[PDB]
Amino acid sequence: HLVPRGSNPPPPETSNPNKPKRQTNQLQYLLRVVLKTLWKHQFAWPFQQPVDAVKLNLPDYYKIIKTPMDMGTIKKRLENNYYWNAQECIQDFNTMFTNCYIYNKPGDDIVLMAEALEKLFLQKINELPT
Numbered sequence: 001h002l003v004p005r006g007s008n009p010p011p012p013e014t015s016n017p018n019k020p021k022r023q024t025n026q027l028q029y030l031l032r033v034v035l036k037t038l039w040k041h042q043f044a045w046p047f048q049q050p051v052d053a054v055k056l057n058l059p060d061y062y063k064i065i066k067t068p069m070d071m072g073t074i075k076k077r078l079e080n081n082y083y084w085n086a087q088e089c090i091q092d093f094n095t096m097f098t099n100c101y102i103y104n105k106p107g108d109d110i111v112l113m114a115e116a117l118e119k120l121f122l123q124k125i126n127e128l129p130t
Ligand SMILES: CCN1C(=O)c2cccc3c(S(=O)(=O)NC4CCCCCC4)ccc1c23
Pocket: 046, 047, 051, 056, 058, 100, 103, 104, 109, 110, 113
């Protein structure tokens, strides 16, 4: 190529083999209710898989975004009991939304989509059990 096209990292890790299986009510609720609701939102699809910098023509994406995150990764982390607590899961959602804000211009369509998803997410985490 005569113009830079970018390249993609391996996707984020989704399992911690050394970590003990510690199931919790909040993590179960995050997987079964919060993530499922977010996944089905009309604006979710761009956030469901890792950014393909090459296919999306975002050649500098991984120059700018040092800690990629997407909902498919979060889903797998929940499934694999990767998180010790709800706060770690919530931090990954936050990384995903803030990545979008970092990379893109405040007025961009993708940013509107992220903001709508983030607003729903923040509502849903008020539901977490004790
Ligand atoms: C959430 C990951 N992500 C981006 O940060 C981003 C920037 C620009 C386009 C784009 C796309 S895209 O599929 O190339 N463009 C979508 C942009 C949002 C408007 C409606 C759907 C098209 C998907 C995921 C993205 C981006």
